[PDB]
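Objective 1.3, modelling of assemblies. Example input:
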Amino acid sequence: NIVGCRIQHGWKEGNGPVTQWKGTVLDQVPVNPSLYLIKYDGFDCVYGLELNKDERVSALEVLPDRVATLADTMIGKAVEHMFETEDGSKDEWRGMVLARAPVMNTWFYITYEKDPVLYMYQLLDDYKEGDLRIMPDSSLVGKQVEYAKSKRTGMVIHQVEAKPSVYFIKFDDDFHIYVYDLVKTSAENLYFQ
Ligand SMILES: NC1=Nc2cc(OCCCN3Cc4ccccc4C3)c(OCC3CC3)cc2C12CCCC2
Ligand SMILES: [Cl-]
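Predicted structure (tokens):
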């Protein structure tokens, strides 16, 4: 519907100030069509919002385009992804390339051990720049999930084709997309229905 569109909207939490956001709608989630995945300009995580019911969203507008519209071997690979720090020095995070992003062609879904939520980057550009090291190599979708150890509910929204024990989860209480490999320790408190 609004998938593939660029959007703008206000955001307000509680009595806080309204901030303005511009982004690109990537996906309307099949198991919950209220849920949209959005890439905001300049922000590297993928966000999920239930736009038709989230009272924090105001003044939702579709923007006009005004401009008219293979490294798939990276998919599934463990990588080391370098980036810049305040001090001028580079650091790196290690992670896994999950998939090509929808809608924004040249972009890839990736997640990281240090922050296992969904990110989206132009990985082939970063590779050409020397900032992406590829390491040598080497349904539950729609179910409810709960985390208790802390009692958090959500839904399994995607399975990663390249690594089928890996799933994307949307928790009811947050707008990040959480990524889990269900055989690992990070997933050991997740239970499904
Ligand atoms: N072409 C790029 N490749 C990047 C790779 C990055 O990091 C790859 C690992 C993930 N980040 C590590 C990190 C550390 C602290 C907080 C959040 C994160 C997320 C990246 O990180 C953001 C900067 C602040 C560090 C930014 C870029 C750009 C996007 C546009 C500017 C350059
Ligand atoms: Cl651990």
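Residues 71-140 form one domain.
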